[PDB]
Amino acid sequence: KVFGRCELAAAMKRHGLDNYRGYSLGNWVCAAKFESNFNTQATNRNTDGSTDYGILQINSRWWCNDGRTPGSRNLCNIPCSALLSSDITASVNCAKKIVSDGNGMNAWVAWRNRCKGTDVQAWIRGCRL
Ligand SMILES: [Cl-]
Ligand SMILES: [Cl-]
Ligand SMILES: [Cl-]
Ligand SMILES: [Cl-]
Ligand SMILES: [Cl-]
Ligand SMILES: [Cl-]
Ligand SMILES: [Cl-]
Ligand SMILES: [Cl-]
């Protein structure tokens, strides 16, 4: 599924991501924009052989199981395929664990490089939330 901007904001709010760990909804929308362009089906291989999955590009090195990332863990206790669903529940639940892991949203290097410090409220501007 390819979400619209306000549509994804609303879905993230509905699943409790709004201000989770102190990160406003615009931060989460911004991250999703630059990680996946709002496409739940996005996958990308990393150089090290792990893969990033879904709307927030969660990595199989730590967070989900894909059967092909030796030495990796599955800390969200989920198949990585679950992170590609139209329903964003599994990706939000896992993102909540990631952002609680100690470095906040710096875990998403596209958030750190493209969102952090910017006018992230622009991402929810105009949205009926
Ligand atoms: Cl957009
Ligand atoms: Cl915001
Ligand atoms: Cl992989
Ligand atoms: Cl997804
Ligand atoms: Cl594996
Ligand atoms: Cl392994
Ligand atoms: Cl959803
Ligand atoms: Cl980046």
From Swiss-Prot:
GO molecular function: beta-N-acetylglucosaminidase activity; identical protein binding; lysozyme activity
Stretches assigned to the C-type lysozyme domain: 1-129
Entry EC no(s): 3.2.1.17
Any single GO BP term: cell wall macromolecule catabolic process
CDD domains: LYZ_C
Keywords of this entry: Allergen, Antimicrobial, Bacteriolytic enzyme, Disulfide bond, Glycosidase, Hydrolase, Secreted, Signal
Annotated tissue distribution: In the egg white and polymorphonuclear leukocytes.
Binding annotation for substrate: D101
Pfam families per UniProt: Lys
Active site: E35, D52
Presence of the UniProt keyword Membrane in the record: no
Cell compartment(s), UniProt: Secreted
Catalytic reaction(s) noted: Hydrolysis of (1->4)-beta-linkages between N-acetylmuramic acid and N-acetyl-D-glucosamine residues in a peptidoglycan and between N-acetyl-D-glucosamine residues in chitodextrins
GO cellular component terms given for this protein: cytoplasm; endoplasmic reticulum; extracellular space
Disulphide bond pairs: C6-C127, C30-C115, C64-C80, C76-C94
Main subcellular location: secreted
PROSITE patterns found in the cross-reference section: GLYCOSYL_HYDROL_F22_1, GLYCOSYL_HYDROL_F22_2
InterPro entries named among the record's database cross-references: Glyco_hydro_22, Glyco_hydro_22_CS, Glyco_hydro_22_lys, Lysozyme-like_dom_sf
Miscellaneous comment as given in the Swiss-Prot or TrEMBL entry: Lysozyme C is capable of both hydrolysis and transglycosylation; it also shows a slight esterase activity. It acts rapidly on both peptide-substituted and unsubstituted peptidoglycan, and slowly on chitin oligosaccharides.
Subunit structure as annotated in this protein's UniProt entry: Monomer.
Family note: Belongs to the glycosyl hydrolase 22 family.
Record's function text: Lysozymes have primarily a bacteriolytic function; those in tissues and body fluids are associated with the monocyte-macrophage system and enhance the activity of immunoagents. Has bacteriolytic activity against M.luteus.
Protein name: Lysozyme C
